[PDB]
């Protein structure tokens, strides 16, 4: 019994100039113990480094990400943790451009 497997590809919705909703599913493989939290990371389009997109892990399967730069393009990925620790990150979401909707 070890850490969870990867979550699936997240969905991004409700995009504004500086916020978005990111949602995902529970990993199929929990490693043998209950999932206690999820890390959400973000990467600006064609940049290399993944960075924390939320201050601390969430337990629900979605979150409102804030602090995104207007005019930038981002993708997001999720990692799950249990008592044994964090599992590998899942694949990146589709990219979204941060802009206030017209209307
Ligand atoms: Cl699920
Ligand atoms: Zn953690």
Residue numbers in the entry: 3 to 105
Task: Give the text the authors published on this PDB structure.
Titin is a protein expressed in the skeletal and cardiac, or striated, muscle of vertebrates that plays various roles in muscle structure and function. Encoded by the gene TTN, titin spans half a sarcomere (the basic contractile unit of muscle) and has various functions including preventing sarcomere over-extension (Gautel and Djinović-Carugo, 2016), acting as a molecular ruler for thick filament formation and as a hub for numerous signalling molecules (Kruger and Linke, 2011, Linke and Hamdani, 2014). Fn3 domains are only found in the A-band region of titin, where they are arranged with Ig domains in a pattern termed super-repeats, which themselves are repeated. Fn3 domains have a characteristic beta sandwich fold, with a core of hydrophobic residues as the “filling” between two beta sheets that pack against each other face-to-face.
Here, we present the crystal structures of seven human WT titin domains – Fn3-3, Fn3-11, Fn3-20, Fn3-49, Fn3-56, Fn3-85 and Fn3-90 – and two domains harbouring rare missense variants found in patients with HCM: Fn3-3 Arg15908His and Fn3-56 Ser23226Gly. In addition to the WT domains, the structures of Fn3-3 Arg15908His and Fn3-56 Ser23226Gly were determined to a resolution of 2.10 and 1.43 Å, respectively. The two rare missense variants have each been identified in 12 patients of an 874-patient HCM cohort at UCLH, with general population minor allele frequencies (MAFs) of 6.5 × 10-3 and 7.2 × 10-3 for Arg15908His and Ser23226Gly, respectively, suggesting they may play a role in the patients’ disease. There is usually a positively charged residue at the Arg15908 domain position, and the Ser23226 position is also highly conserved. The two variant domains, which each harbour a rare missense variant found in a cohort of HCM patients, closely align with their respective WT domains, with the mutated residue incorporated into the domain without affecting its conformation. Both the Arg15908His variant in Fn3-3, and Ser23226Gly variant in Fn3-56, however, result in the loss of polar contacts, and this is reflected in the loss of thermal stability of the domains. The high melting temperatures for two of the variant domains (66.9 °C for Fn3-3 Arg15908His and 53.4 °C for Fn3-56 Ser23226Gly) suggest that for these it is the former, as previously characterized variants linked to disease via domain instability typically reduce the domain melting temperature to below physiological levels.
